[PDB]
Amino acid sequence: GDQRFGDLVFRQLAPNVWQHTSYLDMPGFGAVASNGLIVRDGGRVLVVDTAWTDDQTAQILNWIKQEINLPVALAVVTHAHQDKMGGMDALHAAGIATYANALSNQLAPQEGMVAAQHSLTFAANGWVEPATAPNFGPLKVFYPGPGHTSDNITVGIDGTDIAFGGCLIKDSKAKSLGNLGDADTEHYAASARAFGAAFPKASMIVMSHSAPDSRAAITHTARMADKLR
Template identity: 55%
Template structure:
């Protein structure tokens, strides 16, 4: 085996969500936007009080790989959807929320147990942020080298978060569509903003593949995408982990790819 490739393969496994196709470059990720840079983090406003945070992991042979999450204003505080790749980057997200927005992060939800989604969870715990995740995410986290979230989210049989999580994470609407990119992937809706976050399950409208399927629920991927679409029928802004936000054509393209599995 080529030794360069041999060195990259473990890194790809660690990154977990990186697909079989090359992701958007930094320029493509932020082209046409009014991105605000703060240290290693970029922030783009998707809706009033809703910001997308983007951080990059530089992999040899692949370049900087973007990963997106959300910051959502809730009164005098903000809610965080997913960490950055690293603790250091996540600390910068927390600092931006507190120092620039004057709304410190009070709680965070993790959408699955991969590095691009919870690689910075230790920084959240160090800062005293209340963290939430699917029970399976918490079970898988130590196996992947991460601290589990402090709290497990309870879901109804039809996939909606209930109980303490629904209260603590409001106004976020937390929805488990079923297994797709991973068995534990959850999604987020903000109905008042016409926005939904599909995480790593949803790919952009020009995607050629569904990316890394190593931990995927291939059999149920398509049905889970349909569930996501039905859960947030009025969402016109579809945000996702590794591409810029766009319209519902991203869901349609993802479903086309999933139907071909």
């Protein structure tokens, strides 16, 4: 299944959807995998999250050129940490329109990230304000509340059974909630549950640091997060 392409791994999840995976050494924790998504929408490609680095992100674009060979219309990144936004410069060098939560763009410089070009804003209920996500096609963007970070966002893919929780969601066999350095411990559980409620039909849950799983990823993550309160 997996396709090794340089130092990255690509996995097809559905007819028009692939997972990208890249790795960074976290001294004291090992080589940490981070996953994002690639979606073909007709004659264009949409990306969710960069790789950890500019070089790795350029490799994602190389893989897309080889395996899909259509223009990348836009990328959306799911918060201002390196695993999700570290390759912003590579996207910009490639001429790709980039989007992030307004709060992610605000936080980007202090987090050592380059901001996206465009800011998403959200209604009180968490759904993206449609004017701020033009031409997103099947990507349905939802802010579930603060959890892994204050700015974490999530993405459903219309026409598929897939929803992407980014670093908010861990798989059903995870022992912990990972790096909580920037987490909102009080609200994490409710935010994980809100993600599930936003995408009730999604049977395949994709996330940053585990392989795709069932919705038990959501229930298990939320149940673990109940212990943070």
